[PDB]
């Protein structure tokens, strides 16, 4: 909530993990200048600093999101959650990250009250409230933890349609106890033997 | 296990001079894909119902899955032909098949075949034959559109509950899958099924063909939290709007009645709906697998099929097993289920199955607005990325609740 | 109105014709109702007589 | 309804209201008709409209 | 509803957005559900005492239950509920609610 | 503990809800836990019992306790569920009488 | 000085912000001269592009003068203006994106519907999982009896 | 996307103007594409080199 | 989605603008003579010359 405010392109930002890839692709706001990002590959025989070359464009450009994809291949575990039973919040199960309260509200808009009759009050004012959280935890197993949580979030699709393929790719490979079971078995042509 | 007369059906055009598609479509296909083995496809399919289905070329899961058959069925013309074919885009990439190729250079003299509406038996062509190891992941993938292709329909998803001589190898290890939907079972099943050239060893046969009908009698009403398969039924997750995805879950309630002996079903969807509703799509998929190892009773009988579809070969019949298909519209269908739950009182229908019907009701009509627009375009230009079907096809009817009731006895 | 209930797809005379026209979800009579409806009709005006 | 051996009550036949009912109505078979017979493609999805 | 409120901007009518999305003066008949006193603090704190004060504005404090706190005065002399209001006012919390 | 705690959410457990209209939040799993380990602890030091392998336990998943029943299964398809009644509830009707 | 009104060709370019004044008086020439003095051979500068901050209250007229025109609309990465404002009224603009949201914005939508290529949601049911990584030689027991 | 191949490829940014590009070119640019996967993977062996 | 990257799309024209207003730069109604068929919209590429 200010003047002028924009949308720019940090990769995981919001990334509230002990685990640095080191591969992030940052860009800076529009009001300054970005020059540097798109010259990288190839204007090696222009050395200019404020000039870049246009016609390497299309190159620099497709590493770059190459490495978008890259820094972003990722599984988005769950932390934990609570039952926020309060008047600001309608029963709502909120993600309890282990520090910086800051990140909640950022990722929970509408966890926010209503002071002034603003244009971004407004807003906020017309959208509905209650997908705030989390909706179902899922596990069925009685006394273990949850295999999933299925929560509304500050999310992009796009990023997120990255992590959910990895996932599927990652599905794909994952084998079951029995499977590798035989698979020893098997290598083992009797001789060695594994306890089922 | 090799099936001699693996013989596969390619499919019809919608009164269309040419296969279902556009020059520029089956460019975006063969040449943006490479490999003719479901990988890409399946990639799609598997992001649990999160990504939309729409998109300019492809309008859902089963779009693709329809302009997958039709690929397939058009570029194997050119190398399943008599003295082998292949030009105009697809020339291709070894005779092995290994990559869908545009045109080899000084390669024209095998034309491109222009079929009609055919039908054709892998294992008469030499180079087919001679291949027979790599042959088995394909004809998997043959299998699925043989089995869309043969008819006008939803899917032609075969069932099977083997009763007694159940494996505890079986059991055990599914236990440990308990937590995941359907499709992520699925998918690692096909995956297995294609990298190793086909077993004879039942194991993991079995275990799709139980699944299935866990599956199947989990959607019917007939299993659920009180009735299961020992502990086995699917859990239909999220109330509210009809994405309620089916779950294999382990509970201890009842042993369901052990029916008597060996119980087969074929179900087919006459709704166009199908289409965004990857369930449904999963256990088609599933009884493709089965297909692979199994010689399966001589395929629907001819009395619900369309003319061209007639006659065929080996598979249609009208004197064998299963000779009537097992027909639904998916909405009526979950109605029957919330009747059974009802009819046993494990809920009151008060507030349970009115809200449910109140929004597969708002599902269906949005689903059928959504299909029928996306149908205008191919129904006026000569491109075809979409199951063809008229206003009239979504219609109420088609044996939806004597399926039901055949389902249930099954389970008997 | 009980009886005008709904019909939905193609409108027309021939085949021919109708190939042409699509018209959803609007309404029919039966013969049978039709037979039953007028059989009430005349029923009601023999009782009126 | 009302007692109809009560007061109150006018006769007054007028031009305006020339008794009328309904006697017979028109049954002609040209008048019968409008028009077109429903129909579907085949029973199929949008495709067979031939 | 509290936050359904519209200032007095540049001669504008100060005015809140009665239930159903009415913008209108604050003078009348006011109700407060509970949570949603809990809700405003800071600005029901400062607009509806001023008018409680120096006009007509029947707030409805719509409580349903509570713990009551009692106190015991002389009708000798000339008092006034203002510091008790004020330190009410002061201590209600959107979490929270005094003993009455 | 029943009878109690379904007073604080709804459940289809067999009592009438005098306390409807005494201002209540529909608790949560969680939030019954804390409430019923209070409930725990009274009984306990009331009672001079110092044992937490009395009661304790009660608590440790799902505490949206109905019917505490227990079952065998056995292979040849069949299950064995002794759902054991309470029948005497004095203190339980002086709580309810209370209300 | 005059009037030659210039077309450059280039297709897709990168664009460096200003925001300045509203109620001054501005020339974008110093601005332009260094970017047209600048191009190279081998190489552009990124694109000038100034422009007034929008203002929430009835201010006065100053001059402003610009001279850079886009074919194409590029203003879609402003996410919204003022904000925290009762109306935006001098410079006027607009607010934040609801497409943006639609799950959250609108009940309507049940958050996983087909946004793409269109629009980059960004509040909608994330996924997250449990999953434990045991080793090989752990998932199974050994029998050392060999 | 930068050189003209073999392959069937999507091909989006066409209105992205770029260079006549070499086989010389063509090879900076797969490996710094190949350097890429090598630290994201966290990878000292030879890959694709 | 290109702007989010900081990148734009089309064509400059540098012309003149002395005025009293908030045109946005970023926001341009691309309908002066930008084009070919444009009137007296003249076209050098010629070299040198």
């Not at chain 2, 290890?173 to 995956?191: E, F, N, S």
């Not at chain 7, 929008?54 to 402003?64: E, K």
Request: glycine content about 6%; some cysteine; proline content about 7%.
């Amino acid at each position: 909530e200010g003047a002028v405010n924009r949308i720019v392109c940090m990769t995981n930002w919001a990334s509230l993990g002990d685990e640095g890839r080191g591969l992030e692709v940052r860009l800076p706001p529009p009001t300054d200048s970005s020059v540097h990002a798109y010259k990288t590959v190839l204007s090696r025989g222009y050395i200019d600093n404020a000039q870049f070359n246009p016609l390497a464009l299309r190159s620099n450009v497709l590493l770059m999101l190459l490495q978008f994809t890259l820094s972003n291949l990722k599984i988005n575990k769950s932390s934990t959650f609570t039952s926020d039973v309060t008047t600001i919040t309608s029963g709502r199960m909120i993600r309890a990250f282990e520090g910086r309260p800051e990140l909640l509200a950022l990722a929970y808009p509408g966890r926010a009250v209503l002071p002034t009759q603003t244009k971004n009050a407004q807003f906020l004012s017309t959208a509905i409230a209650d997908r705030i959280g989390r909706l179902d935890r899922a596990n069925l197993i009685g006394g273990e933890v949850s295999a999933m949580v299925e929560c509304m979030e500050l999310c992009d699709a796009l990023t997120l349609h990255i992590r959910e393929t990895y996932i599927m790719l990652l599905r794909s490979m994952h084998q079951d106890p029995t499977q590798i079971v035989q698979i020893v078995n098997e290598c083992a042509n009797n001789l060695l033997n594994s306890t089922i | 296990m090799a099936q001699r007369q693996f013989f596969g059906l390619t499919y019809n055009f919608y009164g269309q001079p040419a296969p279902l598609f556009d020059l520029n479509d089956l460019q975006e296909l063969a040449g943006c894909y490479a490999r003719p083995w479901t990988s890409r496809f399946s990639h799609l399919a598997i992001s649990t119902g999160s990504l939309p289905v729409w998109s300019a070329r492809y309008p859902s899961v089963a779009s693709r899955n329809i302009v997958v058959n039709t690929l397939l069925g058009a570029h194997l013309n050119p190398f399943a032909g008599g003295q082998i074919t292949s030009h105009q885009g697809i020339t291709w990439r070894d005779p092995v098949l290994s990559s869908l190729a545009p045109v080899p250079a000084i390669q024209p003299p095998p034309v491109w075949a222009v079929a009609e509406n055919v039908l054709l038996d892998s294992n008469n062509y030499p180079t087919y034959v001679l291949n027979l190891s790599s042959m088995w992941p394909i004809n998997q993938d043959v299998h699925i559109m043989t089995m869309w292709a043969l008819s006008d329909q939803g899917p032609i998803y075969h069932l099977e509950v083997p009763v007694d001589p159940m494996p505890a190898a079986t059991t055990a290890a599914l236990m440990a899958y308990t937590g995941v939907p359907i499709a992520h079972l699925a998918q690692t099943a096909y995956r297995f099924a294609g990298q190793l050239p086909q077993s004879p060893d039942s194991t993991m046969v079995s275990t799709i063909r139980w699944l299935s009908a866990i599956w199947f009698g989990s959607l019917t009403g007939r299993l659920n939290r009180s009735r299961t398969c020992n502990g086995f039924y699917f859990e239909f997750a999220k109330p509210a709007l009809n994405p309620d995805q089916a779950v294999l879950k382990w509970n201890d309630g009842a042993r369901a009645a052990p029916p008597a002996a060996a119980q087969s079903s074929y179900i087919r969807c006459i709704s166009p709906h199908w289409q965004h509703q990857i369930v449904e799509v999963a256990g088609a998929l599933m009884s493709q697998s089965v297909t692979a190892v199994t010689g399966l009773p001589a395929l629907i009988d001819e009395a619900t099929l369309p003319a061209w579809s007639q006659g065929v070969a080996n598979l249609t019949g009208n004197g064998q097993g299963v000779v009537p298909c097992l027909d639904y519209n998916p909405v009526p269908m979950a109605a029957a289920r919330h009747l059974q739950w009802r009819q046993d009182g494990l809920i009151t229908a008060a507030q349970e199955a009115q809200l449910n019907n109140d929004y597969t009701a708002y599902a269906l009509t949005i689903e059928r607005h959504l299909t029928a627009m996306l149908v205008a375009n191919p129904i006026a230009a000569g491109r075809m990325p979409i199951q063809p079907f008229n206003a009239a096809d979504f219609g109420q009817a088609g044996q939806t609740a004597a399926a039901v009731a055949l389902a249930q006895a099954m389970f008997v | 109105s009980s009886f005008t209930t709904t019909t939905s797809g193609y409108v027309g005379a021939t085949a021919g014709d109708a190939l042409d026209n699509p018209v959803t979800n609007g309404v029919f009579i039966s013969t049978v109702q039709i037979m039953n409806l007028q059989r009430t009709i005349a029923a009601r005006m023999r009782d009126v007589a | 309804t009302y007692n109809i051996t009560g007061d109150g009550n006018s006769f007054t036949p007028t031009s305006d209201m020339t008794s009328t009912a309904a006697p017979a109505i028109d049954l002609k078979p040209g008048v019968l008709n409008p028009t077109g017979k429903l129909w579907r493609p085949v029973g199929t999805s949008v495709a067979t409209i031939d | 509803r509290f936050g359904t409120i519209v200032p007095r901007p540049n001669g504008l009518e100060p005015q809140l957005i009665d239930d159903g999305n009415v913008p209108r003066d604050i003078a009348g008949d006011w109700v407060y559900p509970s949570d949603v006193l809990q809700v405003s603090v800071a600005v029901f704190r400062d607009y509806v005492w001023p008018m409680v004060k120096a006009g007509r504005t029947r707030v409805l404090v719509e409580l349903g239950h509570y713990v009551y706190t009692l106190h015991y005065y002389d009708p000798q002399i000339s008092l006034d509920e203002a510091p008790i209001l004020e330190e009410w006012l002061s201590k209600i919390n959107p979490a929270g609610i005094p003993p009455v | 503990a029943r009878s109690a705690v379904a007073q604080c959410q709804d459940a289809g457990f067999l009592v009438p809800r005098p306390l409807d209209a005494l201002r209540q939040f529909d608790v949560t799993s969680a939030a019954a836990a804390e409430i019923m380990h209070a409930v725990n602890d009274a009984f306990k030091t009331a009672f001079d019992l110092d044992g937490a392998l009395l009661d304790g336990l009660a608590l440790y998943g799902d505490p949206r306790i109905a019917d505490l029943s227990a079952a065998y299964l056995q292979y040849g398809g069949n299950v064995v569920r002794e759902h054991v009644p309470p029948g005497p509830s004095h203190i339980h009707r002086a709580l309810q009488q209370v209300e | 000085a005059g009037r030659t009104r210039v077309l450059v060709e280039l297709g897709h370019y990168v664009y460096t912000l200003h925001y300045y004044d509203p109620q001054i008086s501005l020339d974008e020439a110093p601005i332009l001269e260094e970017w047209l003095s600048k191009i190279n051979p081998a190489g552009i500068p990124p694109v000038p592009f100034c422009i007034p901050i929008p203002q929430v209250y009835p201010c006065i007229t100053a001059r402003r003068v610009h001279y850079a025109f886009t074919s194409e609309n590029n203003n879609d990465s402003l996410f919204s203006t003022n904000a925290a404002s009762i109306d935006t009224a001098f410079g006027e603009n607009a607010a934040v994106s609801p497409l943006r949201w639609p799950g959250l914005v609108d009940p309507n939508y049940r958050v996983g519907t087909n946004d793409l290529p269109n629009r980059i949601t960004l509040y909608n049911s994330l996924y997250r999982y449990n999953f434990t990584y045991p080793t090989l030689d752990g998932i199974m027991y050994v029998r050392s009896a060999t | 996307q930068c050189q003209d191949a073999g392959f069937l490829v999507p091909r989006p940014l066409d209105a992205l103007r770029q260079f006549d590009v070499t086989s010389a070119a063509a090879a900076e640019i797969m490996h710094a594409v190949n350097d890429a996967f090598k630290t994201a993977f966290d990878l000292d062996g030879a890959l694709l080199d | 989605e290109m702007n989010l990257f900081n990148v734009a799309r089309g064509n400059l024209y540098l012309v003149q603008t002395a005025t009293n207003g908030n045109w946005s730069p970023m926001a341009p109604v691309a309908a002066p003579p930008f084009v070919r068929g444009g009137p007296n919209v003249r076209v050098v590429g010629r070299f040198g010359t």
